[model samples]
Target: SKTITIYLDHASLPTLNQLMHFTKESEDKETARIFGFSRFKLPEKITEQYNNIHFVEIKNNRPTEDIFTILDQYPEKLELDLHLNIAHSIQLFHPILQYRFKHPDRISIKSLNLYDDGTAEYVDLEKEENKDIKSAIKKAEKQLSDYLLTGKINFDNPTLARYVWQSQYPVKYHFLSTEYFEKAEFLQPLKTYLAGKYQKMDWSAYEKLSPEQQTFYLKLVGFSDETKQLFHTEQTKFIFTGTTTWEGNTDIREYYAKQQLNLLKHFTHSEGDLFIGDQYKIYFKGHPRGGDINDYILKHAKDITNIPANISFEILMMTGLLPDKVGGVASSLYFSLPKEKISHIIFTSNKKIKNKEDALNDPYVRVMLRLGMIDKSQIIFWDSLKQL
Candidate 1:
């Protein structure tokens, strides 16, 4: 069997919780000793049990070329997979590793996800001569091989793996407390967010804007009047990307109905992080991307010079001690800010909402509430907007 080490982003408690859910581990385990953010380490045995990864470990926390390193002195070496599913970040250093290894099969660990029904199954790099494997497996690995060689996001082959540390090895936290989730996942990794230095607008900014400005921003981000109405009219829980795929078993329209969101009407497909508020005016571009919606907003973020680019939905979550990115929510505004040194208070949400755990029944919501990070008095909910 092949042994490899993979590096992952353990940014938040949910990031940890997801690992715990994936590996079936408790928070008190040895890995829980990390700070609130920017920490890395994983054992091969843990990955084998969780992601079918080869055995590996984080040799240290420092990085060269701003890279997260691994002790790959052994035969397997290291595989740095940016589990974010964004391949460009890996593209930055992939070539050097290929040249260093000088062998196609002996290079790095490549991974991909296959979405069908409700599953995001990961496929690892397989060898050509390994007749023990099937043709389909080789085909998939070959697809990843090509993608890794080139620096581009291939929506055409969504199954092909994104970039990785490209080595022999790799690297959860959740059950313990809400503190770690912010620092590791959201607060500390300030650089990986949006290409801009988008700052937090005072809550009043939400109320201070005219109805026209509010309408414009919502439509800019692909959120329609339906989405605004939910925020305006109902006591709707935060809308999370679904845990299941766009196919069989679940009817998305009905699903949104149950979530009490009119937002789904803007979504045409049931895949990725979409809110279906208006069925006809669907806002699809691609998964892991803002599609036309995000592009439009950023394109005009500067255009509407007066509106101020210093705003994000992040304050809603971080300020309320709610999750920045969890329950399938991706591209959250808080996690999409410009690069800046994170401060201690930046990570502090100060348990403002008492019954936050009681708010949403979604799986991630339930898990977070049980973790007890939110306090009722400080909820970054509707009233938070009224005052801001």
Candidate 2:
């Protein structure tokens, strides 16, 4: 099997030069350059030679030179496992204490560090003779090692073992909120309800739900009926919208669809933040074309914002996508905003719209579409806007 390697060189001393040197050594010459985290343009010659090339931004302080040197020395090594010491330090401390403090009930004891690996050794501090901080540290370190090896630890035991594990040795704590579990529990029911409700109601009736409810229903059902109709015209004008395509595709829809699907897979599998609460918002700004779709967005925004008692709205003009490089399909425009302010005045260009429209129309759009939040006509309107 052939292998492609990507060496991400940060803006550090002679690292870029070293990367070029290493690239010359490879028989396949399989690598590319990403100018920075946000800019990637492959060389024409390299593209012709290799099908697999990826550019990733180098995290600051990562030893790029050291990595290249190691790979150079071990040319036959098919895999390079480079771990950052600083990241490892952070991973071993800070968050564990926080977790113990927050949820004492979840703390547990697993083992004791009986032998020292030149640095430290574990002894039960609870033992009257060894009841000291040093002993506690050793025990905790041992327990951590045990946990890593066995994938089991007593998270609920309130022993010297538990305290030591919690204090002397630490690890990052990742726990989902009750709300997230609730959402997971509600997903099936919510989706079923929205699908039925959308099938029965008119656009105006569907739009009457509160924004929170609206967002919920959208997540539940995926695509809004009203929004779908807007795009489902006789001569559907597909629009692709975005700043640039990493895949070098002129079609924004294809680029964003692939991106959104990957994101959905990652977030779902990793149990990442998914709720469209106050935590997220979408904003569109830049030069606008003189089209009816733009007019509709502007007019609708005016009407929505003018109502003083309702949610206030504002628009900012920025070059490239809002929130910079957090890429998304055009339909993501609807899913990215906070559920309460779902109808706020975020508008992008026809260029961007044409890029993402068809992807949004695809069935996978349902993944990001929140429950009850967006009407089908809204999707249709966005699709229609691309033509104008």
Candidate 3:
């Protein structure tokens, strides 16, 4: 089918046989009912309508290309009931969906099949070795009763209710694999699973480390201190005012200065007249890491205030740390004001740079040069300046 919905089920005979033979007798038709008694207390929507859905079985190690070829035989949108082998599905389908579709949107194309051999089952409570099972089931019933009465339940603690259904049967449940169990309906208390996993981790000691040590630790977690800081900080605003065109092979410093001049001219002629006052005060920011133009602006703007009354400024750098292809030749402009006024920031960089690092660096250089000029101009006319 050109457009199709696919469901993958990885429920295997070994897993299903274990559940049926261990949990339910040969004559028990309440397999669904018994299964529902395990953890989450099946929602009414699922239990009542169980018969309406179709179930299809898939074997392990099958390629998606083969699946698609079979699916392509249908013309219109097709609704599929897929039973998948978990290991094969994850290995083959996860990459296919990820590379093919954009974020959040592609998530709709796939779902984890909980009926896979790796899901959890209930164990017998009466056996001497299963004392913990008996106690766990009792605790779950009590907790469920409390929830029914008070309309409050701690779904976050699976340890408290893990064996609730075991009291009714002399069965033992084994989790085939934890990969899909954490995603299953009964174990939908994801926080519990995550918390349990975290308990075994070194986060406490990791958190107790000194700031520098913590920075190092974060690098292990695939994050840097700068990234962590950005996650917590408020959205910053910047203004860019600079020239669009320049001569060939100009020195990086001179190229930055000309762009800053163009931006300053734009601000002075526009918002600066009303907001900067007669003092001719201006704030210019530059980058810590040196670059062409864009880089100069970003690094410097990081320190500038967003106050509307203050003539806050920044620089943009184009080269040095970032690749030229990623940091294009365009600049940005921003004006910061209080809640009532408009805050403007601009960017200047090459038209070619597409990488995020290069784009950021290009603007930074412009800001640094502009700030230098402002500092010099202020020194020359200190007596004429007025206070805000």
Candidate 4:
């Protein structure tokens, strides 16, 4: 039995989605240890159950070369696996980990998905048949790997220097991803060669449950019943989702707020028309990381209805607080929403000019729509909202 080392981004109290990943075990009874990058302490409940996890404190919340520089200490013979979510740093780490471990077999890389049934997504690299795709990945990996080892790198210098100082322990690679992500354009070649089969996500059973029953089940999971009554109302609710500015770019942060307002105005009808209607109540839900509705949008933008920013949309979905219609420029909340319950789900391009860069054109949403993970009708650019 082989001991496996699982790399994770950061973890907290396991959500319903993550519970399965933690519980999975090896068929051979191989023991495992989690190497989690710490933001906060790992849940005591999990540690008490598993008992062998360790933390790696990431300085400034950034995974730097320092983390990879020390990879030499571990036994190179042990199997290494990556079971983390995609982040900007992942593109850098993925290659480095493989190059360091240099396992005779391809290292397993699992991409955790929130909405799947926890089935294994595996790709047999040996069985990959397309020379075109095989060549593309090989070419790209060579381009990237060579760039890393030579110190002729354009990005982080110290990490490349550390890697250049050390090194491939032959490069078999495993690619795991959600079905929605399998069809990502940027991932097209990688999937063709290093990909696996997929099962479409189904939420139909949950969608069919009566509101009262749904609320009951939700309460059992710890959601408040105050929102239950809100779901029962005849009045339609319109929620304008907010975006986070975690990257600390004030320019993009200001742009997100501006677009949120544009989307609000487009849907609510202009201020000069006179009749202020109460049939529809509009609410702005802030991003969990930080950005909230702009002051002008919150106060002067015709007194837009406000919902507490702290309430997660996931809770709203369970406890039935989500309104009759929902729209956002490119808010991720739409991914969690059930289409059958909501009457209108709108996404529009909120560009500054007729043709300009904007968040609404986000490739993630476009990829999800193309892969049928998100209903095509939900994307206005792909299929117009006029159908409504």
Task: Give the number of the best model, judged by lDDT.
Answer: 4
Superposition TM-score, candidate 2 onto the true structure: 0.24
Error of 4 at 349 (Å): 10
Question: Estimated TM-score per prediction?
Answer: 0.25, 0.24, 0.20, 0.46
- Whole-model alpha-carbon lDDT for candidate 1: 0.28
lDDT (C-alpha, whole model) for all candidates:
0.28, 0.29, 0.31, 0.42
What's the lDDT for candidate 3?
0.31
Candidate 1 positional error at 176, Å:
20
Tens-place lDDT per residue, model 3, 4-40, is 3333433332223222222222233322211211111
Worst 10 residues of 3 by lDDT: 315-324
At residue 322, what lDDT does model 3 achieve? 12
Q: Candidate 4 on 1-388: residue-level lDDT in tens?
A: 2345554443221132222233333122235554445433444534555544444545443344554434434543445544442222343354445454454344333322222212112122222333454344444445456753553443332211211111232122211234433544544655454333333332332355566445434433344456444456577777766554322235555655555565556566644121124567777766655434455457546746655543566546433456666665455455555454332234433432122123334544443445454564444431132211
TM-score of candidate 3 relative to the true fold: 0.20
State the number of backbone clashes in model 2: 42
Clashes of each: 48, 42, 95, 1
lDDT of 1 by residue, 2-114 (tens): 43323333233222322322232222232211211133234443333343322222223212422222223334543333232122223323433544445445545444211
Runs of candidate 2 exceeding 4 Å displacement = 1-181, 186-334, 344-364, 381-383, 386-388
Provide the global lDDT of candidate 4 against the true structure. Answer: 0.42
